[PDB]
Design a protein around this ligand. Structure first.
Ligand SMILES: Cc1cn([C@H]2C[C@H](OP(=O)(O)O)[C@@H](CO)O2)c(=O)[nH]c1=O
Ligand SMILES: Cc1cn([C@H]2C[C@H](OP(=O)(O)O)[C@@H](CO)O2)c(=O)[nH]c1=O
Ligand SMILES: [Mg+2]
Ligand SMILES: [Mg+2]
Lengths: 194, 194
């Protein structure tokens, strides 16, 4: 009876693209880079690899480094919106996020980041998983276009959160976007209420 | 169409009770302890607290310490059974586990432990969550008696994995047990197949 909304972390709450670019340029100042306006495709490393050999690996080294995830800036309006959303009657919010493959820092720092911006109690709302299709909900707000896994018919509707890497993408008609946290997320939630 | 089984970690794959007792006695040799045969109730700290003041906090300090989760021994038959289970046709296995509240080590070490016993590829199967009711599956094999959360009608059947803390518990009749990994887990899976 409560509406259940999964909110993705990187690309939705936390500015992974901006953080990556800043730290990449700082560490590899003699290398070429991709301006955010020129990003295409979800995987940063794939575009960097196309741009010259060995650059994929240098890109990966940025997000595998300590404090990369912890130091990400929140996207504008994201913390306020999620706080408001969680406080709504008949509304349960989980943060549903995937770790990178190297697990030394990323799990820990994602929990740390949520504590920082949402408080200790909000840690109870974190679902860390590589497969979001096995998490049941009414809505998943996520910047990644292709959300696949072991469940062929997830219970949620995937609402595509706009990011630099996806802003030009034409989606299969029934599919919907949340263009930013200034956009009308309440109306999206309301369209799903019983 | 594939059967989906969530397998819990502590108390099912990893021997949290035995590990705790060993390290508690080593660190607090002048304190009284609870032999595994005398354990009752899921929460170790609650029973320790009843046994004398301040002992709850000393207990908690054991599992909050570095390497506690990483150094847990697998339960007999657990690694072999899960490997066999995951290899079965039409059978998807996820490891569904909750972190403790202090997140400095536990997330990381649980991933590390799964890598150690199941290999890098099995990391894709981990779901870290405080709420298992929002994870959809056919079966949840879990030593904790009370599995609650935001979903009042989970999709899985909870099969109670026997542990020292629950072995005397009378369950509400429809509820089922897996008494150990030597017990016939294949038959349990089969009862759920379409
Ligand atoms: C490699 C890579 C990871 N990520 C993020 C997304 C996942 O986090 P999240 O699920 O919070 O969006 C995590 C693992 O892929 O890292 C990107 O956002 N872009 C990338 O290019
Ligand atoms: C405090 C406590 C935690 N745990 C485990 C269970 C959870 O792991 P798991 O979900 O893998 O069983 C984790 C957080 O409570 O620590 C016990 O098994 N016994 C306890 O007394
Ligand atoms: Mg994302
Ligand atoms: Mg357990």
């Amino acid at each position: 009876r409560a509406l259940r909304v999964l909110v993705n972390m990187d690309g939705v709450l936390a500015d992974f693209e901006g953080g990556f670019l800043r730290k990449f340029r700082a560490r590899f100042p003699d290398q070429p880079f991709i301006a955010l306006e020129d990003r295409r495709g979800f995987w940063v490393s794939e575009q960097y690899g196309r741009l010259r050999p060995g650059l994929s690996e240098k890109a990966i080294s940025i997000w595998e480094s300590k404090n990369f995830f912890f130091e990400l800036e929140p996207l504008p309006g994201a913390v306020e919106a999620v706080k408001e959303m969680a406080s709504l009657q008949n509304t349960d919010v989980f943060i549903c996020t995937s770790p990178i493959k190297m697990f030394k820092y990323c799990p820990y720092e994602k929990y740390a980041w949520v504590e920082k911006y949402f408080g200790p109690d909000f840690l109870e709302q974190i679902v860390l998983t590589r497969d979001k299709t096995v998490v049941s909900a009414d809505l998943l707000i996520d910047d990644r276009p292709d959300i696949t896994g072991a469940e062929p018919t997830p219970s949620w509707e995937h609402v595509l959160f706009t990011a630099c890497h996806n802003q030009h993408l034409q989606l299969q008609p029934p599919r919907r976007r949340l263009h930013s946290w200034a956009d009308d997320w309440k109306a999206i939630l309301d369209s799903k209420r019983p």
